[PDB]
Ligand binder design. Structure first.
Ligand SMILES: CC[C@]1(O)C[C@@H]2CN(CCc3c([nH]c4cc(F)ccc34)[C@@](C(=O)OC)(c3cc4c(cc3OC)N(C)[C@H]3[C@@](O)(C(=O)OC)[C@H](OC(C)=O)[C@]5(CC)C=CCN6CC[C@]43[C@@H]65)C2)C1
Ligand SMILES: Nc1nc2c(ncn2[C@@H]2O[C@H](COP(=O)(O)OP(=O)(O)OP(=O)(O)O)[C@@H](O)[C@H]2O)c(=O)[nH]1
Ligand SMILES: Nc1nc2c(ncn2[C@@H]2O[C@H](COP(=O)(O)OP(=O)(O)O)[C@@H](O)[C@H]2O)c(=O)[nH]1
Ligand SMILES: [Ca+2]
Ligand SMILES: [Mg+2]
Lengths: 439, 54, 331, 428
């Protein structure tokens, strides 16, 4: 067993992190105080769930997690909230004032004054790891910390841990819930810097989460707790394989190998179904056919885009609940004739499939109903470059007038780093188009 | 069409199904980057304090 | 009030559309790069599809089906028919064609069936023995297609002249397939040249290569009431029975084939689009499909009517305001 | 605790400052003696943005009161909440400034400034995490105008990296009859253009019209004007004083509102408008809140929004209402009048909703626009300035304090540049 360390950066990473660790605990039967009756190795072990938890002589299972916000408001909630015994203080790291939705202030100005203390607290976790495999980094693109500190920490982690893997869970900026008009700036900036230090990035457009919450959960104006519970499920699906017995995606290097043939095109599209309101008065349960088909509907993706107008390089079906292979292939058979699922010549048309018999765990009281089977698809499609195009277009509109640029320059960043980052994204968009050029 | 690598636990199953075959900076350079920046800024601020003293 | 932007300034068709829409007091035109539109009359090239359907508060509708270029490019149309079960060699209405590259093409598979009264066609170039044809495509550098030339066309009288037929098909967001009831034959001024064709004007009936060499029709446009009245008197039939039934079956088959790849049923933006379909009626009254045009122009006589139908079928149906010129091809 | 140091200088500055303090004190549940008596944990969460605490669990406005003459101080000490202010925080002289900017900036106020700065630096050395400063003052007089901006130049030199914020009351011949006010405003605007991060332009032209026209108040008093001015100040500071996501500190606010450093002059707006003492009979609907607060008749600077384009915009709603309907209504505004928001700042309108309504309303909306239409404000003052200055009229009241004409030519130039600068981005 090889341990995985989570790193929650910024308000979004921290609040998403909190929801994941609550979902995680429910799933492995760990109580709000790290106690886990079902573990019979008191004091430790090397079970599959020890990749995400380490063990205390007195019986505590404590996340291999580190939270870091540049101000105290949010992590204070964790220090005081319901799961406060689960983390020990050394891993909740908070600063004085924040990065004011300014990438340059999180990377250059305030970052420098905290990078070392954070790397310290991280190495403390590596030291109690028999065979550490890599990092799971949770952050937003749009704030100052989540973009600019996160890109600084990444570059340090690559220097300090070359052998290790790093996956991202990245919250893509959406007007319906954004709190800054500079978010496209911070998003290009931190994607450019981080591209070469992240092995696999799971982008979640707050826009997509928001509509799923309105359309399928009947939530008038979804809040961050709605958004984050849904994100906790998608994320739990993608990490189920590292915390449970299985033979698919059993270590971070396999997300690389299964999903990412090209290092820069490391942004696989997640798709999840079924999302059912727990308020629905009885629900006609969905079939393997029905849930697997759902996976090719844009309205179920973590990023709106049209994978018909691009090619595939990889595709994973992660099932949870009551599923047997015959059904899955029966299902894949039908849709293969109904849908437009063209791969890139230099790749085979196939699906890797993972089934975990234990159905999706529902947060008691939450908005999600408890379904007898569920599925997350991880497809590396080129249609996800739609999301790059529209974010790059917003950057261009503002940048051609230098609007707000003076805030980043005022922190010591040179105007030129803007065009460098955007030039990268222009290359990245060309890469994407080359791969999917055919029809 | 072809089911490969089938593996079964008591938690679930794993397998592949293929329908058709085919056909870095250093802690050194990082400091020069950051310091140059806090440089570019401390100078801008001092340009400001100098104008304010005029 | 609805808003719309105009991003293809050389569209006679959508100049009239925006003219009508404005002429209603319920539509405003925006700066082309203002994101807060309801209707994009989009560009012809690299229309930014991925930017549509992400403006909250806005239902957005655009006048092109992404992916519809597979049906409207000559290299692609051929590949679409051949490599698609719903059409395939199941096809009796498309001339024999092959794609070819000026040195996954068919220049070798083309010679194969060539061993057999062989006349073919390529800015175009027709011939009877290959070599010269294959040589021509090797001259230029863009992919080229070589379909059998239709040796025995149906010839209008008086004149003994060749014609093609243009039908405009509108497809709305629901994927209704609408056939404007008025069509046009683009005739020829000079009589068809049985022996010897490498001259053109009298074979190629394109309006341009004929307002440059031309008598019986104004502008060389024969509309349907006259072509029907002619068919009755010379062939004892109707346009309906003889031609239109095959046209509808060709339009309906083509667009349903690609409907899974370009439908916008559950998409975050909607599409409609106007197609120009071009047909060839041969000696035996068998219709053949030539090209599909993704940005048709109209005929001057008919702009008024087709352009109000577009507004009513395709735009007012999605943004309603404060006895039909079309034939819905029921699939 | 991200604290804010409040400075109020001059008659106007001290009178709208004292009225800001009694209004937010209510909102937070502090009585004139500094004791909390509220019915909500929401009232105390961010209390330390504007207050200090002492033994007895009393709250003291983090506020400094400055005038070159001794009234007003007396007026404020003997006002409703007069007794809450730390007494050592009253800093005042005796001479006065005679509505003379040079007296405030250079001569009289020079003598007094350091005593103001020691209370400022005292209050600052006592802060966990200082956001910056907020000053209230007028531009038409001598003390708030000339000494107000002197203090901004000093404070910025001591705190070059904190945020400087002002509520700057602009003069209008509809309300006052001192001929030199256009001089004191143009010398002040030059200063504000160079040394503040955010300035709310409270225009006495717009406050007068709202009171006379809209509110039917045919003999308006300053208390009437200041009623509108404290509703606005309360409004535009909600996001700093309660919990929330949008614009919750001054730097956050500046990064959202200020796309270019000199264009930091804001049009406040508010709805519903109301006379002091106006019995309020029915709430507004969320759609009435919205169309109204973007209405020109509700702006606190006298400028026509439809004569410009909005660069950035912040909207604040207060009271129990539906997020869904606010969001739908804010979206319709931008979609129905979309040419009024520059297309090259995507999504330039940010919205917050606070549950706690202001005093006496069940529902209000506060608007903060950074519109190029505010050039109309600077053109009005520049035209009044030019008419006198082209004959150097009244200059001796200033040259006799030591000033030189050239300093006038420079203010006039830097403000004409500010106008031409707004015009640039209004065409673009
Ligand atoms: C909110 C703070 C204030 O209270 C607002 C004001 C002024 N102030 C003192 C109060 C006062 C007023 N009037 C007075 C006459 C006196 F002998 C002594 C005192 C006053 C005002 C009032 O209550 O009026 C009934 C009052 C005053 C004025 C006014 C309206 C108004 O109220 C609707 N105009 C719009 C101005 C005026 O120039 C014009 O029309 O052109 C624009 C006036 O010319 C006319 C009408 O002919 C007038 C009238 C004396 C002429 C000379 C100097 N201008 C300076 C202000 C202006 C005058 C209330 C501050
Ligand atoms: N879905 C979701 N998105 C969030 C959440 N919190 C923050 N975000 C995203 O983050 C963006 C704002 O920037 P943040 O990443 O939160 O910045 P921060 O963590 O507050 O740190 P600062 O740089 O100091 O602002 C918003 O536009 C959101 O899209 C959350 O809890 N859930
Ligand atoms: N809105 C409002 N404006 C005021 C008030 N008091 C003064 N003013 C404005 O301020 C200008 C005079 O400035 P003044 O008070 O003499 O400045 P000071 O000498 O520095 O205190 C006038 O033109 C008024 O329009 C007030 O209570 N409310
Ligand atoms: Ca164990
Ligand atoms: Mg934060």
């Amino acid at each position: 067993m090889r341990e995985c360390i989570s790193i929650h950066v910024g308000q979004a990473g921290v609040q998403i992190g909190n929801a994941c660790w609550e979902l995680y605990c429910l799933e492995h039967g760990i109580q709000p105080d790290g106690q886990m009756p079902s573990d019979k190795t008191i004091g430790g072990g090397d079970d599959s769930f020890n990749t995400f938890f380490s063990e205390t002589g007195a019986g505590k299972h404590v996340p291999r997690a580190v939270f870091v916000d540049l101000e105290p408001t949010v992590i204070d909630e964790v220090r005081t909230g319901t799961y406060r015994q689960l983390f020990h203080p050394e891993q909740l790291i908070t600063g004085k004032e924040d990065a004011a939705n300014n990438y340059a202030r999180g990377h250059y100005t305030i970052g420098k004054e905290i990078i070392d203390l954070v790397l310290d607290r991280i190495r403390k976790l590596a030291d109690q790891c028999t065979g550490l495999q890599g990092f799971l980094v949770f952050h937003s693109f749009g704030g100052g910390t989540g973009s600019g500190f996160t890109s600084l920490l990444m570059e340090r982690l690559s220097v300090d841990y070359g052998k290790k893997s790093k996956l991202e869970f990245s919250i893509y900026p959406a007007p319906q819930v954004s709190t800054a008009v500079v978010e496209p700036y911070n998003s290009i900036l931190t994607t450019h810097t981080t591209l070469e230090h992240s092995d696999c990035a799971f982008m979640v457009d707050n826009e997509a989460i928001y509509d799923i919450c309105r359309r399928n959960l009947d939530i008038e104006r979804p809040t961050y707790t709605n958004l984050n519970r849904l994100i906790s499920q998608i994320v739990s699906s993608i990490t189920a394989s590292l915390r449970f017995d299985g033979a698919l995606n059993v270590d971070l290097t396999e997300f690389q190998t299964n999903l990412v043939p090209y290092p820069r095109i490391h942004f696989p599209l997640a798709t999840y179904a079924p999302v059912i309101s727990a308020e629905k008065a009885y629900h006609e349960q969905l079939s393997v056919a029905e849930i697997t088909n759902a996976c090719f509907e844009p309205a179920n993706q973590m990023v709106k885009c049209d994978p018909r107008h691009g090619k595939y390089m990889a595709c994973c079906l992660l099932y949870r609940g009551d599923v047997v292979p015959k059904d899955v292939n029966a299902a894949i058979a039908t849709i293969k004739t109904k849908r437009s699922i063209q791969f890139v010549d230099w790749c085979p048309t196939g699906f890797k499939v993972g089934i975990n018999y234990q159905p999706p765990t529902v947060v008691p009281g939450g908005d999600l109903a408890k379904v007898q089977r569920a599925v997350c698809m991880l497809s590396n499609t080129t249609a996800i470059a739609e999301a790059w195009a529209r974010l790059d277009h917003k950057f261009d509109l503002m940048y051609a007038k230098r609007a707000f640029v003076h805030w980043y320059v005022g922190e010591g960043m040179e105007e030129g780093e803007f065009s460098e980052a955007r030039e990268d994204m222009a290359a990245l968009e060309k890469d994407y188009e080359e791969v999917g050029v055919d029809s | 069409m072809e089911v490969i690598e089938l593996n079964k636990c008591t938690s679930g199953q794993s397998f592949e199904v293929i329908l058709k075959p085919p056909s870095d900076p250093s802690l050194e350079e990082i400091q020069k980057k950051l310091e140059a920046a806090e440089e570019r800024r401390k100078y801008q601020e001092a340009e400001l304090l100098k104008h304010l003293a005029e | 009030m609805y808003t719309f932007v105009v991003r293809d300034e050389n569209s006679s068709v959508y100049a009239e559309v925006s003219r009508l829409l404005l002429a209603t007091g319920q539509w405003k035109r925006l700066r082309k790069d203002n994101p807060r539109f309801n209707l994009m009359l989009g560009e012809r090239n690299r229309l930014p599809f991925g930017r549509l359907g992400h403006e909250p508060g806005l239902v957005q509708l655009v006048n092109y089906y992404r992916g519809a270029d597979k049906l409207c490019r000559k290299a692609s149309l051929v590949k679409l028919i051949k490599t698609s079960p719903e059409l395939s060699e199941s096809c009796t209405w498309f001339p024999e064609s092959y794609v070819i590259y000026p040195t996954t093409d068919e220049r070798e598979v083309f010679l194969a069936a060539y061993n057999r009264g062989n006349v073919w066609i390529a800015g175009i170039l027709i011939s009877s023995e290959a070599s010269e044809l294959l040589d021509f495509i090797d001259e230029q550098g863009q992919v080229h297609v070589i379909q059998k030339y239709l040796e025995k066309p149906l010839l209008l009288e008086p004149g003994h002249r060749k014609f093609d037929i243009r039908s405009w098909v509108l497809v709305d967001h629901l994927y209704n397939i609408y056939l404007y009831r008025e069509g046009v034959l683009r005739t020829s001024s000079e009589p068809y040249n049985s022996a010897n064709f490498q001259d053109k004007t009298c074979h190629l009936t394109n309006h341009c290569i004929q307002k440059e060499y031309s008598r019986y029709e104004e502008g060389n446009e024969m509309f349907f009431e006259e072509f029907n009245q002619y068919l009755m008197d010379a062939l004892n039939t109707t346009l309906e029975n003889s031609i239109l039934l095959q046209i509808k079956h060709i339009i309906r088959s083509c667009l349903m084939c690609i409907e899974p790849a370009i439908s916008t049923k559950h998409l975050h933006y909607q599409s409609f689009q106007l197609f120009g379909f071009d047909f060839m009626v041969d000696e035996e009254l068998k219709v053949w499909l030539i090209e599909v045009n993704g940005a048709p122009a109209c005929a001057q006589k008919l702009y008024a009517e087709l352009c109000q139908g577009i507004v009513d079928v395709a735009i007012s149906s999605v943004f309603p305001l404060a006895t039909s010129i079309f034939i819905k091809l029921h699939h | 605790m991200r604290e804010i140091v409040h400075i109020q200088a001059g008659q106007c500055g001290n009178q709208i400052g004292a009225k800001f303090w009694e209004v937010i004190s209510d909102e937070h549940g502090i009585d004139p003696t500094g004791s909390y008596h509220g019915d909500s944990d929401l009232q105390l969460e961010r209390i330390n943005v504007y207050y200090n605490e002492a033994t007895g669990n009393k709250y003291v406005p983090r506020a400094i009161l400055v005038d070159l003459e001794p009234g007003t101080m007396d007026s404020v000490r003997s006002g409703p909440f007069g007794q809450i202010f730390r007494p050592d925080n009253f800093v005042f002289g005796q001479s006065g400034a005679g509505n003379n900017w040079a007296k405030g900036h250079y001569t009289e106020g020079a003598e007094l400034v350091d005593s103001v700065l020691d209370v400022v630096r005292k209050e600052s050395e006592s802060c966990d995490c200082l956001q910056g400063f907020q000053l209230t003052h007028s531009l038409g007089g001598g003390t708030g105008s000339g000494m107000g901006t002197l203090l901004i130049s000093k404070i910025r030199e001591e705190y070059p990296d904190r945020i400087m914020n002002t509520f700057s009351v602009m003069p209008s011949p509809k309300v006052s009859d001192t001929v030199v006010e256009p001089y004191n405003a143009t010398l002040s605007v030059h200063q504000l253009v160079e040394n503040t991060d955010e300035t709310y332009c409270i225009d006495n032209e717009a406050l007068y019209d709202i009171c006379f026209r809209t509110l039917k108040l045919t003999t308006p008093t300053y208390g009437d004007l200041n009623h509108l001015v404290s509703a606005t100040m309360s409004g535009v500071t909600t996001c700093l004083r309660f919990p929330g996501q949008l614009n919750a500190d001054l730097r956050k606010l500046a990064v959202n509102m200020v796309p270019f450093p000199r264009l930091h002059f804001f049009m406040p707006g508010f709805a519903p408008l109301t006379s002091r003492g106006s019995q309020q009979y029915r709430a507004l609907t969320v759609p009435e809140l919205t169309q109204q607060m973007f209405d020109s008749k509700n702006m606190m600077a006298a400028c026509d929004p439809r004569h410009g384009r909005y660069l950035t915009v912040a909207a604040i709603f207060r009271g129990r209402m539906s997020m869904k309907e606010v969001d739908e209504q804010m979206l319709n505004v931008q979609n129905k009048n979309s040419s009024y928001f520059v297309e090259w700042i995507p999504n330039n309108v940010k919205t917050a909703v606070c549950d706690i309504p202001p005093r006496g309303l069940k529902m209000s909306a506060t608007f903060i626009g950074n519109s190029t239409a505010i050039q109309e404000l600077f053109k009005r003052i520049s035209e009044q300035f030019t008419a006198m200055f082209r004959r150097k009229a009244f200059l001796h009241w200033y040259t006799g304090e030591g000033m030189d004409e050239m300093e006038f030519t420079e203010a006039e130039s830097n403000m004409n540049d500010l106008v031409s600068e707004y015009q640039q981005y209004q065409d673009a």
